[PDB]
Amino acid sequence: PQVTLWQRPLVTIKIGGQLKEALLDTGADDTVLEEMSLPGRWKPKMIGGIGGFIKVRQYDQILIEICGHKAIGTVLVGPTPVNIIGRNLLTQIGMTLNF
Amino acid sequence: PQVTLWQRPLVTIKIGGQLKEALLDTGADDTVLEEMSLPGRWKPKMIGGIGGFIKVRQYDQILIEICGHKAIGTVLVGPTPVNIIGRNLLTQIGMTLNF
C-alpha cells in the first residue's frame, strides 16, 4: 500500500511472537529494535547514528512480519530509541519511494 | 519518479548555491546537513538519534532543490555524519513510501 510521509511512517511488526510498532526508515541500512527477547544466538556489533554509536546484538535469519509481509533477515537488538526497519528488510517487502 | 532501496537513496541537492549529496530518510523528522555556509540568521536547537544527540543550527525558510524539485523549509546544520533530507522536505517533493 502507498504511504505518504506527512506523518512518521509507523507500521506494525510481529517478531519473536511479539507485536511491536516500528518506523520504516530509508536512511537506515540495518533494522534495529529496542531490547526484546529473541531466540537463537547473537554476535556483538556497533552501529552508528546521528548522535554517535550504540552497542547491539546481531541476529541473523530472523523472521519478521511487516504490515502482513513476511521477511527474513538480520535484526539488531540494543539501546535504540525506537524500532527501526532498515533497508535490509525494506527491499524484501518491495518498498519504494515515489516523487 | 520512483526509487528502490537496494542501495542508499542518495540524491543530489542544491542549497545555498552549493551542490551536495544527501540521503532521503523517511525515518528523519527533520532535514540535517553537515557543516556548510548558509546565509541568514539561525536559532539553536538539539536533535536526537541512535548514539545520542547533537547540537545544530536551525535555519528557516531555506530554499533547497532536491533531485530537481524545489522546496522551502527548515534546515538544520551541525555535526551529522551525512546530509539527511527528512520528512519536512520529503513531503514537498511528493515523496511517498509505497510497498
Partner: peptide
C-alpha cells in the same frame, strides 16, 4: 539514519 559501521 542507521549506519552499518
Amino acid at each position: 539514519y542507521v549506519d552499518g559501521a
